[PDB]
Amino acid sequence: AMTIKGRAFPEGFLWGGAVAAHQLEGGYKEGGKGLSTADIMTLGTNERPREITDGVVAGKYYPNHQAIDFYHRYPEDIELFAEMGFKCFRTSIAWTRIFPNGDESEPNEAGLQFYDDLFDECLKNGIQPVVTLAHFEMPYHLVKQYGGWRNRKLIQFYLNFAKVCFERYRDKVTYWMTFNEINNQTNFESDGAMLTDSGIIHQPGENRERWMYQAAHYELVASAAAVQLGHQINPDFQIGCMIAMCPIYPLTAAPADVLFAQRAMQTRFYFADVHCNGTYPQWLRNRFESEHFNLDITAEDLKILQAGTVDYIGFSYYMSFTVKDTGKLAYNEEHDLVKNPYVKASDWGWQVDPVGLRYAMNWFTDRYHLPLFIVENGLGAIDKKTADNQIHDDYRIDYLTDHLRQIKLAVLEDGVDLIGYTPWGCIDLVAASTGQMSKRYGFIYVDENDDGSGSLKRYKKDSFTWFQHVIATNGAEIE
Amino acid sequence: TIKGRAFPEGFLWGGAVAAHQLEGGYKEGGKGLSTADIMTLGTNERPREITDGVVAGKYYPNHQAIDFYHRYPEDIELFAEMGFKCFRTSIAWTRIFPNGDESEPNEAGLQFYDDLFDECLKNGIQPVVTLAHFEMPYHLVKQYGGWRNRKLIQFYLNFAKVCFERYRDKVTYWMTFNEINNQTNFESDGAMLTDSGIIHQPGENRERWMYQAAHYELVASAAAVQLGHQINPDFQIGCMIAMCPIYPLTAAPADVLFAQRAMQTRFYFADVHCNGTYPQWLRNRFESEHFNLDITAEDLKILQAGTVDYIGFSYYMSFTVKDTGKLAYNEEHDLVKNPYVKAQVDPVGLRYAMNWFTDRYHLPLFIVENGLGAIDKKTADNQIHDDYRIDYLTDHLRQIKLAVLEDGVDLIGYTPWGCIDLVAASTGQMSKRYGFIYVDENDDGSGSLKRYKKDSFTWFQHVIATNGAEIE
Ligand SMILES: [Cl-]
Ligand SMILES: [Cl-]
Ligand SMILES: [Cl-]
Ligand SMILES: [Cl-]
């Protein structure tokens, strides 16, 4: 009876692609650019974690130094994006190109000039930049000198950075987001999440949980202040949060499983609660008191939080989680997740849950009643370039199709308000988890090996063509 | 731990009833015939017969009930001894407007509630009033088609205005429509009659007419919040929601999405009551099913300005669902057993439901129904040992206590259902008992109607006098 084929996405829908500066740009030293926390992360494997080193240690390979050299090649890459018909380009402004060490009193003109040029290049091509301010690339100086977001000073260092960007680019960007995947540090035991989100490398004697919430608080306050500041520079600016949206199912209908899963979602998405409601949920305030965290939270902080709630919720989606009741009060993401036996290998071997995206979209809408922006979704897989220089990546086409199907249902049937959709790593870039080029997400193949060798030549994948057609038909054919 | 910690200062402990389930005096003081007054006695496997007015030869248990209309002084004596802070009841619509469409209220019905409320207030017990509680005038059902008809909005408002004005110095908490979301089960004739005064006409699209009637009710609720706030700006005017949380049976993504939609369907009423607008998924449904409902721009403006001050709710059970394959939730066919709950009583769902309401709406809550229906036996020495009832209420109160003290849910009070044994809604039986007070009435209406304290009476007395501090 009901069908979605033949029906277009809404008019004005922002199809695009998504990246982060540190994962594609390279030129990590060009133009007086500072050493970021991305620049101290060595290459790893599927089995071997990336090494966080103290500065650039000698005889180690850092894949973010060159990446795919987009700092220099962006006009060629953007032409490929306009050939696909992108309506937007989601990327980050490297904090380290604008304030290399993060505490300077004036910005870096060479860095500001780069984004002028990059954005001018997008805009003459019909492509509006969608910009994330903090994206796992903060000045390492801030980590060494201040202890990262342990320190309330980062609130003003962040705002200096946002101010300069808001003003410089105020006729060039409409959509901004403050802190990429701010809620990864929900897993406070993940060294990767503490560094990327908050620039925290654990010190002996520290309560990891306590300092995550201290750090998240300051960032949430910084985000709220940036919304207000932002709206003052350009009232047309749409300013959003960025949430990693892994929904957490109860394993079974056992009441205690269902309650525990509620508390896991509450714990993982309190960040969104603050961004959107302007206040801390009361259960978490109660947790702050009963664990005696004694957090540095001022009455000024709370007023800023309540005036600086966001215009929309940008999120990533990749997977869903499952939990059963542990007997325990709190959700610890490192230890409490169980296997979901109802989700099995797809035709291509990897597990996905496209239904959870629909679920997630209804969960955001019914809770906050704000527009959403899907700014990260994609398949990381091995691609082979054939002798005749093609990549037949129908495993990537299927992946995106299965997800787009559910998104199309969420919007057309469920009536969820979606600004757009920008699949992750539209051009093959350095993967966050391992720093391998080999784990590829792109519509565009970049001839680079994991050791950084290769010509770096761009080639179209078959998915490039499939996605061009989707944009050209505004998603009408998706069934 | 929570052991030794009190509920918040001023927590409204009490008991709840509905005028039609306990008053009796169904023709007294010019009282009109209600929809409760046309329902015969039934059992578990035998629906209450609906009749067209009162037929001779049939027994109607609500006609007499437990005679609280004449016995309220004795009965309130027992509530005051138990130590109630509030008494949650309905004002019988047919006592104030017998046919429902009169231009003037009935002075004797109004004076009954003056007498009743003053009797409560002289003992430190504040009334908490639900305006529509399954007892609308049968004149409105018969001649207008109940809430199928837009004219009922004004009829409700004439009723509400009068009650707000008359009891302005005597009632702080009000609620508009009892369990407004029972009619989610649009295949349920009982739910349709009790919520919306709809006796089915063949040819009629049940679901469509539900949505239409529920719309006018939501509009009337919105408009009465504004009216009451104008009459006494210190009034708290809430909704009343039947909170049956719906669990996915397994973590299968299709089961999880279906449970989301099941709860979206069942609780959109709450969405409209609190958010002040229709959820977009449902509006889309109105379009794709071609309901062509009567919804004006003016309706949408009243709704948005008339959102409630708090959420009143009943809690008895949770439901479970698996994916059916279908696009829509049908509550008459789509529920499956929860194999993880003892043989569906579920105290932890209460805690869940409280967080759910709180995280979704961020409004204060009021638990206005909760309790255990059971066959109570009176011993030869006139004791009722309802240890099962104390266990049930303790299990629920413990979950309520965690929700409030740890989870920081904003709870106004707690009034268990049927604090004095009354006529059950499901069957019209006395023998399915909920009370702290046992009433000696058989299902055919015979007996002394004498009152006795069940063991739970003294238990709840001590819960109140310690403000829940021993609950662990
Ligand atoms: Cl998954
Ligand atoms: Cl990274
Ligand atoms: Cl659905
Ligand atoms: Cl929610």
Residue numbers in the entry:
A (entry chain A): 0 to 478
B (entry chain B): 2 to 344, 350 to 478
Q: Which of the paper's sentences describe this entry?
A:
Specifically, the β-­glycosidic bond of 6′-P-β-glucoside is cleaved by 6-P-β-glucosidase (6PβGlu; EC 3.2.1.86), releasing 6-P-β-glucose (BG6; glycon), an important cellular precursor, and the remaining portion of the given substrate (aglycon). Here, the high-resolution crystal structures of GH1 6-P-β-glucosidases from Lactobacillus plantarum (LpPbg1) and Streptococcus mutans (SmBgl) and their complexes with ligands are reported. 6PβGlu is a single-domain protein that adopts a (β/α)8-barrel (TIM-barrel) structure, which is a typical fold of GH1-family members. The GH1-family enzymes utilize a double-displacement mechanism of catalysis with retention of configuration at the anomeric C atom of the glycon moiety.
The LpPbg1 structure has been determined in an apo form as well as in a complex with phosphate and a glucose molecule corresponding to the aglycon molecule. The apo form of LpPbg1 was solved in the trigonal space group P31 with six protein chains in the asymmetric unit, 547 water molecules, one glycerol molecule and six chloride ions. The refined atomic model included residues Ala0–Glu478 of chains A and D, Thr2–Ala334 and Gln350–Glu478 of chain B, Thr2–Asp346 and Gly348–Glu478 of chain C, Met1–Leu42, Arg49–Ala344 and Gln350–Glu478 of chain E and Met1–Thr44, Pro48–Lys343 and Gln350–Glu478 of chain F. The crystals are merohedrally twinned with twin operator k, h, −l and a refined twin fraction of 0.28. Superposition of LpPbg1 with apo LpPbg1 yields an r.m.s.d. of between 0.42 and 0.65 Å (for chains B and F, respectively).
